[PDB]
């Protein structure tokens, strides 16, 4: 049980500190940088077309 609990706690802490703490910044990067900038370029191009 000590071996199993050590492995489980290590996996849980490792995930909560690396996997989640990289996936959440990964999603934030995706949205905030790429989706927002692509939408901004689309907005600029259609605004120029309207002009």
């Amino acid at each position: 049980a000590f071996i199993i609990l050590d492995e489980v706690i290590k996996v849980t802490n490792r995930r909560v500190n690396a996997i989640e703490h990289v996936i959440i910044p990964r999603t934030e990067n995706t949205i905030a940088y790429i989706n927002s900038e692509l939408d901004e370029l689309d907005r600029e191009e259609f605004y120029r077309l309207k002009k």
Binding site: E7, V11, R15, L38, E45
Partner: protein, 229 residues
Amino acid sequence: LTTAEYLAYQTERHVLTILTDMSSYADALREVSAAREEVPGRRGYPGYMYTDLSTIYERAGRVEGRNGSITQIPILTMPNDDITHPIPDLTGYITEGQIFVDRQLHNKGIYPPINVLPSLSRLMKSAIGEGMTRKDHGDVSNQLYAKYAIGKDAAAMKAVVGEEALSIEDKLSLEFLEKFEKTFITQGAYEDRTVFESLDQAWSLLRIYPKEMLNRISPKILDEFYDRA
């Protein structure tokens, strides 16, 4: 493509057309469209690029009454290693397959660095089997694709969770994936191994698994070919 059409459909030759860099063609089209102040379709590319790529690609294949054909194998570089880019996306929408050269596979030293998961041949289904290639080709290809996909999934899980959490199927999948990438995909630039040698090597790869877990192939093919050794 016009000189290829002349040779294939008028002189009855078999033309293997190779287009060196379709990305440069797409960039030239984008430059012309931008200078034309036309409505962009995606990230500055013209909105009619679908029709232009259809015109370029569709002038291939065999036509009725002529003894010639055009086998078109264009080459295009994805700008950021992604299928989602407009060039490869619009290419795949009209083409009948693709061969994916994978950067991660190339960095591993494998040549040719062809990834089979994104690669496809949309008209391979009716070109293999009885009286053409060997009758196990389709099922062997299906089993290899399924095992490779399971190997990638198990490698991802092993990256996420421990190896012991993986089933025996998953460990066999990693073993098959390693031997597969190192021996079957890997091939010398001057080797020219026939499809029958490739099928025999594929069977030697598949014989890692027991008969029970080759579920994607018919029992007839399995009990005909598995024990040949």
